Structures are given as structure tokens and as C-alpha cells.
Design a protein around this ligand. Structure first.
Ligand SMILES: [Cl-]
Ligand code: NI
Length: 129
């Protein structure tokens, strides 16, 4: 599913990401925009042989099992395919574990490079939340 900006903002709000660990909703929408272009089916292979999955590009080395990443820790205890669903629940729940892990949203390279320090509330402007 390719979400609209406001549609995704609302879904993330309903799943409790607004101000989760202090990160306002626009941070999460911004990260999703630049990680996946709001596409739940997005996949991208990394140099180390792991793959990133879904709207928040969650990596198979640490967070989910894709059956082809040796030494995967699978900390979210889910198959990576679950992160590609039109229902964002699994991605949100796993993301809550990641952002609690120590480096906050810096775990998402696109967030650090393209969202951090910018006016992220622009991402939720105009939306009925
Ligand atoms: Cl933090
Ligand atoms: Ni990545």
C-alpha cells in the first residue's frame, strides 16, 4: 500500500507514535517519506547482505528474520515479510523497540540526514488528526 501523507500520519497517531520517546509525529512521517516513499512494500538490499523492509526500512540483521541473513538476531520476533503489510501495526511495534534501543531515531539514516533539525511539523500540516 502507498499511503498518503495525512493518511499515514493518522495511522501512526492511532498506533501511539506521536511523541513516542519524545519524537513528535512529523519525525515519523518524515522518516517514512525518505525511507520508503510511504510504500509498505519497499525492500532494499544492503552491502552486508541484510535487507531493509517496509515503510520504515527495518533491517534483517538485527530486527526481523528473512531466512537469508546469517546471524540475524530477530529482536522483533517476526518474519520480515510481516513488515510489508498494508497494516502498519507490526512495523510500528518493531519501530518502538528500535527507537528505545539507545540512539533514538538516529538508527534511521534517512531521518538523521534529511529530517533531524528540520521543521518536521510541516509533514503533518493540513492534516485532520
Ligand atoms: Cl532520544
Ligand atoms: Ni537502511
Amino acid at each position: 500500500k502507498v499511503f498518503g501523507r495525512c493518511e499515514l500520519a493518522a495511522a501512526m497517531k492511532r498506533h501511539g507514535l506521536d511523541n513516542y520517546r519524545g519524537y513528535s509525529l512529523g519525525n515519523w512521517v518524515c522518516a517514512a517519506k525518505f525511507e520508503s516513499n510511504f510504500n509498505t512494500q519497499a525492500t532494499n538490499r544492503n552491502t552486508d547482505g541484510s535487507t531493509d523492509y517496509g515503510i520504515l526500512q527495518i533491517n534483517s540483521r538485527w530486527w526481523c528474520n528473512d531466512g537469508r541473513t546469517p546471524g540475524s538476531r530477530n529482536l522483533c520476533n517476526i518474519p520480515c515479510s510481516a513488515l510489508l503489510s498494508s497494516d502498519i501495526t507490526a512495523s510500528v511495534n518493531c519501530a518502538k523497540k528500535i527507537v528505545s534501543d539507545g540512539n533514538g531515531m538516529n538508527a534511521w539514516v534517512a531521518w538523521r540526514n534529511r529530517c533531524k533539525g528540520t521543521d518536521v511539523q510541516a509533514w503533518i500540516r493540513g492534516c485532520r488528526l
